[PDB]
Design a protein around this ligand. Sequence first.
Ligand SMILES: *[C@@H]1O[C@H](CO)[C@@H](O[C@@H]2O[C@H](CO)[C@@H](O)[C@H](O)[C@H]2NC(C)=O)[C@H](O)[C@H]1NC(C)=O
Ligand SMILES: *[C@@H]1O[C@H](CO)[C@@H](O[C@@H]2O[C@H](CO)[C@@H](O)[C@H](O)[C@H]2NC(C)=O)[C@H](O)[C@H]1NC(C)=O
Ligand SMILES: *[C@@H]1O[C@H](CO)[C@@H](O[C@@H]2O[C@H](CO)[C@@H](O)[C@H](O)[C@H]2NC(C)=O)[C@H](O)[C@H]1NC(C)=O
Lengths: 221, 139, 139, 99, 93, 214
Amino acid sequence: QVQLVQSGAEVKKPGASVRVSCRASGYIFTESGITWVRQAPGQGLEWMGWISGYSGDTKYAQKLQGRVTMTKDTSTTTAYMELRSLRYDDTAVYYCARDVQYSGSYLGAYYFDYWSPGTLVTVSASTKGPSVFPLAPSGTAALGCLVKDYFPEPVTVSWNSGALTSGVHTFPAVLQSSGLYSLSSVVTVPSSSLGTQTYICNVNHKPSNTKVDKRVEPKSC
Amino acid sequence: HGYTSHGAHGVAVAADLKSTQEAITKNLNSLSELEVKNLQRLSGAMDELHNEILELDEKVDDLRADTISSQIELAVLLSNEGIINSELALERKLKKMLGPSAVEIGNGCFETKHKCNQTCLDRIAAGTFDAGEFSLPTF
Amino acid sequence: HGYTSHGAHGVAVAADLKSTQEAITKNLNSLSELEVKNLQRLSGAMDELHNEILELDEKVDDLRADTISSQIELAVLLSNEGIINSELALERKLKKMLGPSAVEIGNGCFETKHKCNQTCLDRIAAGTFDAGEFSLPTF
Amino acid sequence: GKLCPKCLNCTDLDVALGRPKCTGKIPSARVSILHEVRPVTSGCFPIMHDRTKIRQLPNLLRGYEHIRLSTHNVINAENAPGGPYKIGTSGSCPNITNG
Amino acid sequence: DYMVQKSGKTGTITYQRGILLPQKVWCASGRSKVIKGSLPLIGEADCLHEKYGGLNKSKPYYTGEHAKAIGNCPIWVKTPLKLANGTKYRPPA
Amino acid sequence: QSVLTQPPSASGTPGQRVTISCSGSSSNIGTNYVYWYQQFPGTAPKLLIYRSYQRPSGVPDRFSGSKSGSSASLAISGLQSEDEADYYCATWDDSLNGWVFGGGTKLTVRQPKAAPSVTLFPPSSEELQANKATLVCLISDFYPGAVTVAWKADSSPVKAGVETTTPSKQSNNKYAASSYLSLTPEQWKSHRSYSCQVTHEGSTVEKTVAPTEC
Ligand SMILES: *[C@@H]1O[C@H](CO)[C@@H](O[C@@H]2O[C@H](CO)[C@@H](O)[C@H](O)[C@H]2NC(C)=O)[C@H](O)[C@H]1NC(C)=O
Ligand SMILES: *[C@@H]1O[C@H](CO)[C@@H](O[C@@H]2O[C@H](CO)[C@@H](O)[C@H](O)[C@H]2NC(C)=O)[C@H](O)[C@H]1NC(C)=O
Ligand SMILES: *[C@@H]1O[C@H](CO)[C@@H](O[C@@H]2O[C@H](CO)[C@@H](O)[C@H](O)[C@H]2NC(C)=O)[C@H](O)[C@H]1NC(C)=O
């Protein structure tokens, strides 16, 4: 059975480097190659490069020449990918894949077959509570809570300490390129309910013991 | 390719099989049996050491491909010329079985003194037409 | 190229423009669009050091020029053959508008039952000649 | 393709240089494919490759239809000129046994 | 380093301390027609093209990138060529 | 910006035949073999079609590969629930000297198609006092779950400081997602208006804010 097994998940500060391992099983390693492909979270596939299990010959993607190095070890039938000078764009899942080609110029006349499970590399966050900002209402009316810049997940949002539930939507977090999360929560309310009724979002971020009751009130000019 | 009959009997149409059978495939086989030597890397070459020799190799390859290409193009051009110019013989075969009972129009047509229906035309297509039946001078 | 009229009306002369227009220039353009690779000194050569390689270079150059020359000569020869053999079609166009009112002489001439003056001939040159005017069988 | 297949974890240069455990039948062909433009060793003792033409040796052998390592020896090393020689060996070059 | 010795001829080496004297030696004859490919070799082909790899012979000639090729091959041509199967274009009347 | 162009979304009722196109150029699809990969969420992609037309073992004849000039296409016939995934085309590109991937098409086969609700929040007064500004664009109630988001400063595109989440299956098996546009108060003040436009099934829903209005 053709197997590929990678090293564990990694987390790194920007500027450092990662070495990801790829051990091979169930085929003649010295007559195949390895490619590497990476996938930014929620994005497409980016080819990185290939290395021969027969000769150690390599070819890297133009965008990654300089920063990447691939090596391999016939003894342990293992391949390694090194990525230097990590930036936030290098946060991705790193796959290795068995590539049928092992000598001659690498020119895409062959293809890669089986993909390994994937190793995630995260390029610095250190537990911060969120900043909570009101999203003021403009007959339905929308009002919300912006929960900015926290780590790690998850925060919790209720409205009016749980007594407001009809119309509440809390959206999943977005992960900025800064490694920090933000989410939002909206209630749709009667537009006549403004002015007489109060609205408070309750934000609970347990990992930082942050608890915030934010009053969302109509804007004046 | 074939022959057509006109008149108050309607319009008759027939085909000639020998013309069709004669009609290109043989020509193609002739083109397809062309054979030429291989052009591979020379064996004492050595990329690192002798580049100049190697550059000359490249030169001889390119030159070969070019020349041989020109030759082929010619063979084809000639062949097509033949195929298109040949397209007038049926005329001569038809003229053969009449007698001077018809005049050469030059339109690829003749004017026969009698009338010719479908059964009459199939007999000319088969080449079995000789008219003493419509009694007119025989070749 | 053109057509001539004889008789007791004198001798009429006319010209055909389509024949003239058809008449070589296109052929020439076809010859003139031929393109061939350059043949310059090879860059790792070195006159002092590698003469032998160099002698072979010379060889490949000379051989090229020769072959390509032969090819060209052929193209021209063929082309000229066409130009000269083509020089008989006007005959067929004239035969077209008569009827069997004239006999094929084979001299490139016909004998018409009527007389043809200059104005009559310009109409054949223009291709507008159809005679029911001189009333004789029409094609 | 490969100088000798069945000499596993061996490159053609390896087979050419006669690296221990890379030896085998190098069969014959009327056609060969040149896969390594700058061929490599996969082990034994460190070579300074680039200071001689040695790298092309496999591609040279490749050019021929028939190839074969020899038998015996083209010269007795121990009796060579310059005084009796012991013959040196090094780890990094293990043999059928090891050592 | 290696040194080739012609058919029959002997050879010479001069040395000081640290010499590796040759022992076993390559013996070669015949000639193989070499092309620039990249393993693995998969399946069969009529033709092996240095640019295109495996190839099967379809039409007599081909257009494209030209390079060294061995086996039963189509011939390289400057332009895609057509043999005429038909008649000259005639406007209706 | 992907070299190969794949529609973000493809769909069909179960049993139907849907196609996914993949649009390239001479250097890639025109001169090279096409490959197709299928990915279920949080798994490795798997080879589905190889050398433009072939099927690996395991892959049913329901999947079919096509190629014409600089464009290839994946056809999925007899559409079934387990074909819900992302489909990626890949070919070598001789111009960029490396493999290239299409953006990936999400295949949705159990609900009527619904357009997205969009609501756009300007920065709060509170946030602007902290010298920050964020535009919040919330997208909800769309199916199937694939949208693209574009932002505008007045009427010219903005790409910097944009963070969109992958869409998330929500309370009713419809989909929702969010997008943020981070600005300096400086920037926010300098424009007449800002826009969040959400494209879904070849149809755009737009929402606009103006710094001056309340
Ligand atoms: C493989 O290597 C071993 C040593 O690692 C070789 O054994 C030596 O043999 C020589 C004579 O051939 C003796 O002088 C040494 O003392 C041996 N070494 C030891 C420590 O035993 C062995 O010959 C090699 N195998 C072959 C067949 O070449
Ligand atoms: C060239 O032609 C032959 C046609 O048979 C192909 O060889 C066959 O490939 C198929 C698999 O695709 C096998 O089922 C046959 O057994 C093969 N025959 C042999 C003897 O190998 C070959 O793949 C073709 N090459 C191409 C299309 O480039
Ligand atoms: C050239 O064209 C002719 C038709 O103009 C082709 O003849 C046809 O052949 C097919 C089978 O190959 C028949 O089904 C048709 O009935 C034929 N047409 C007629 C009217 O005869 C011919 O095959 C072509 N030549 C080649 C070699 O491609």
